[PDB]
Design a protein around this nucleic acid. Structure first.
Ligand SMILES: Nc1ncnc2c1ncn2[C@@H]1O[C@H](CSCC[C@H](N)C(=O)O)[C@@H](O)[C@H]1O
Length: 327
DNA sequence: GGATGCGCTGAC
DNA sequence: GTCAGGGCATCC
């Protein structure tokens, strides 16, 4: 993550729904905002959250009385995406994990915060012929909010990972916010090899598959894209190897394969998956962030997380817009 | 819970 | 046609 000198959100309260690792909390706090409530039902996610923020998020949001939630200015929610991912069955609102947005709507209807800041996977924008995005838009508008949605790729904001997500920012209409803008992209100057730990710390992550098929030559010149160098098995998810001179393949929460969750990388002549700390770095988390003791759970958490830097730029812009109140 | 072979849609 | 997409099925 980056340093934010002008605290655009100082004095503003926000809630951390579907908290996870608390990526929204890190981003919003770096801009000066104060967290007044967090909710996350996964046991291990609650543990890592408490380990880093000192509080256990409340459980199952579908069972929380929206009226009990503290007053706040900004509602943050990177709600579940398994039901909208191209990797899944895409059942959307017909999936038990695909109706959480309506819980958000229920909370917004009651608390009416100045801003609703949501995030989901890129495919969310075109899921079900775009009908899914339209439902969220209509819902937000009927709740009396504007709706700004855009798919952003982490590689355009200083993070060496090809991770496209949709970001949805909504302003309460009475605020008359007319100048919100999504961050403008900038040249990437960091690559996977720049975030790697020393070899002595990741020997256990080395995988030697005798069915490895190198499909391309390694590159010496860094590039802002994923560069596949080979495959293992049938080359399915988790069986693909990339160059550390390019950017990271998108981390996964429920992904499989011998290189599950992180994908494989060619490092000093060997093929290995990433270490939880390297996953934290490709997601923009500071090295001071404490990862969950269970590597399996840590990989899951990071594969579900938000890219901090991207949220920081957006949060800064949200604050910038809220602060422009000329006579 | 941990691990991994897989399935197959879809962006372009 | 290529290969990415940040899940599913099932074993212990
Ligand atoms: N009904 C429910 N109540 C509370 N939390 C829920 C929930 N359904 C899903 N979740 C939680 O929603 C999260 C979505 S992933 C969001 C991760 C978060 N932005 C962070 O930065 O890492 C998951 O951690 C999941 O356990």
């Amino acid at each position: 993550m980056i340093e934010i000198k002008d605290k655009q959100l100082t004095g503003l309260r926000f809630i951390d729904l579907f908290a996870g690792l608390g990526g929204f909390r890190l981003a919003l706090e770096s801009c000066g905002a104060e967290c007044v409530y967090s909710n996350e039902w996964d046991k291990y996610a609650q543990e890592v959250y408490e380990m880093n923020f000192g509080e256990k998020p409340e459980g199952d949001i579908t069972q929380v009385n929206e009226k009990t939630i503290p007053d706040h200015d900004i509602l943050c929610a990177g709600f579940p995406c398994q039901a909208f991912s191209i990797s899944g069955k895409q059942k959307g609102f017909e999936d038990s994990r695909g109706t959480l947005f309506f819980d958000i709507a229920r909370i917004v209807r009651e608390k009416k915060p100045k801003v609703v800041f949501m995030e989901n996977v890129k495919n969310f924008a075109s899921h079900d012929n775009g009908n899914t995005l339209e439902v969220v838009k209509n819902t937000m508008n009927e709740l009396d909010y504007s709706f700004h949605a855009k798919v952003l790729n982490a590689l355009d904001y200083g993070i060496p990972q090809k991770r496209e997500r949709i970001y949805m920012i909504c302003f309460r209409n009475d605020l008359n916010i007319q100048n919100f803008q999504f961050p403008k992209p900038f040249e990437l100057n960091t690559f996977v090899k720049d975030l790697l730990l020393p070899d002595s710390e990741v020997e256990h992550l080395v995988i030697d598959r005798k069915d490895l098929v190198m499909t391309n030559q390694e590159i010496e010149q860094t590039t802002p894209k994923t560069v596949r160098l080979g495959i293992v098995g049938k080359g399915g998810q988790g069986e693909r190897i990339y160059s550390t001179r390019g950017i990271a393949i998108g981390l996964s929460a429920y992904g499989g394969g011998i290189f599950a969750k992180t994908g494989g990388y060619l490092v000093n002549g060997k093929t290995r998956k990433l270490h939880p700390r390297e996953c934290a770095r490709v997601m923009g988390y500071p090295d001071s962030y404490k990862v969950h003791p269970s590597t399996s759970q840590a990989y899951k958490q990071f594969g579900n997380s938000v890219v901090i830097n991207v949220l920081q730029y957006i949060a800064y812009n949200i604050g910038s817009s809220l602060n422009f109140k000329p006579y």
